[PDB]
């Protein structure tokens, strides 16, 4: 029992991050097959970060210009190419500790693990949740863009972030390994200011079984609601509406504690409604929302 | 910026972790060298658990019989010793993935990464306390014993906990890496109840120079306090004593921000008496204690 912000285990993602350094910038590189994926502003001065043109930028950039470093061993750059705001260094040596992988481009609510890194070194794992005003609320220092986010299908890892930039108000923004941006977000220093962070319903309910499967259970109430009523609460709170599937997708937690989806969105309307009044759910004093339907599950049964 | 409960990465532990069996009861191994620890429990059935003889369960045991699988490999094992709570399962090949390493007995309020794993396959990461009443509060199901909790220093791995149990109340005890546990617990399946789970005061400063480095600071105050006057409070609210060892632990983060610690002290105190008003501190609405100075410091500079 117990329930813990829990991240996948890093040691496959550990072994793909590399260091890539262009001219004075210093970032993390991800080592899959021959390939290093970086963010694209590792050819940016500070001063280039205010108005870059990439294409422009990338003319005076050559493959012995991008020094990738995996340990203290060089790779030798034999190739470069820019796909959106990722660069694709070709290093002449498939990373021998490449694990099985995908790229996958996330929806907003699901979570998934970062190693952050500096100078291509892990110094942490952390969970987190693309927000869904499409950023993350991470913990990133200079030199940890091109950290990346995961998650594990036993053996295989679905890339599914890269870290790219802080906007002002200390949110990050970042893509996928195609690197397409998440939300609306550019890599350019500017006035991006993130919309609306709405709370992540399903996940909130999600939380609220895990709860109960681990016994804490004094926010179980006596009533029920419809999709509709609870989405006007939703609404009121700036919680995401909850859609037939969620429900469907909640299914599962609904079915192993008993407890009905429309039942468990009334609590949550109550507890919206009348606060945690000083009492704590496993372990916070509020609503939480960085865990999947998908999260609870795997660890509420323990899948490796 | 941003101030995330971070694991270390868990590669070199994942490399350590094997699947130990006696009988009908399987757990988690740790390999290092040629020895694999794993918590004596392994012994004993569901039965045994109720009032376990170690040395005599043992006495029915034979090399033989601790099946000791690492991945899909099954290790030999060519000698078995009991020390403390745990077994030493000494085995025919050394670790390859052997990562340089430490025992260590850690103090209440350290903070040290959890590698949940189930036959001998990790499943998360997750960071936790010793708690002041030397239980953790962690995610472990059946069949996760065995699994460790560990500190990183560069390229050592400091070994501190390994997971035997939960008690009644679903608060985990565990043992070091010498078999001793953490506080007056024992392998065995009575009433052990835990003593006051009192809030780790040094731990929470820390999170508070944490919170005004990356920027979050309404809590800040007009107020200083003295030791003894914040004790009064601590006290009051189950904080842990603050010593002049704490501040001392404290003074970099004092002066990073330039805030006195007794400064910090006063603002805790408005925050205990005065609750955060339906506010939140990096994103917590209650004052987090599993972050130790050190793991503010870490995390504020990006040590790899
Ligand atoms: N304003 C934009 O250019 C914009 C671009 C992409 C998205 N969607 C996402 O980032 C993820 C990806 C899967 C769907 O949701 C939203 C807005
Ligand atoms: N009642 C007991 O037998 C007991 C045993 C050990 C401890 N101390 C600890 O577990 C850690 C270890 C470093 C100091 O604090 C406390 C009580």
């Not at 690197?179 to 709370?199: K, L, S, W």
């Not at 109550?270 to 960085?290: F, K, P, W, Y």
């Amino acid at each position: 029992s117990g329930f813990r912000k829990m991240a996948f285990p890093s040691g496959k993602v550990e072994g793909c991050m590399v260091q890539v350094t262009c001219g004075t910038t210093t970032l993390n590189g991800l080592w899959l097959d021959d390939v290093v994926y970086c963010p694209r502003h590792v050819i940016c001065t500070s001063e280039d970060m205010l108005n870059p043109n990439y294409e422009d930028l990338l003319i005076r950039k050559s493959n012995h210009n991008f020094l990738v470093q995996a340990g203290n061993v060089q790779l030798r750059v034999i190739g470069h190419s820019m796909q959106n705001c990722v660069l694709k260094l070709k290093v002449d040596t498939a990373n021998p500790k490449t694990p099985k992988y995908k790229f996958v481009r996330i929806q907003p609510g699901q979570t998934f693990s970062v190693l952050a890194c500096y100078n291509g070194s892990p110094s942490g794992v952390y969970q987190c949740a693309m927000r869904p005003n499409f950023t993350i609320k991470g913990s990133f220092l200079n030199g940890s863009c091109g950290s990346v986010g995961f998650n594990i299908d036993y053996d295989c890892v679905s890339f599914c972030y890269m870290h790219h930039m802080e906007l002002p108000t200390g949110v990050h923004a970042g893509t996928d390994l195609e690197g397409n941006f998440y939300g609306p977000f550019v890599d350019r220093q500017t006035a991006q200011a993130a919309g609306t962070d709405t709370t992540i319903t399903v996940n909130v309910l999600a939380w609220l079984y895990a709860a109960v499967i681990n016994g804490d259970r004094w926010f179980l109430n006596r009533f029920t609601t419809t999709l509709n009523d609870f989405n006007l609460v939703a609404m009121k709170y700036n919680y995401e509406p909850l859609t037939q599937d969620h429900v469907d997708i909640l299914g599962p937690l609904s079915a192993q504690t008993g407890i009905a989806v429309l039942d468990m969105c009334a609590s949550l309307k109550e507890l919206l409604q009348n606060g945690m009044n000083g009492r704590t759910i496993l372990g916070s004093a509020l609503l939480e929302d960085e865990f999947t339907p998908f999260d609870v599950v795997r660890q509420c049964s323990g899948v490796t």
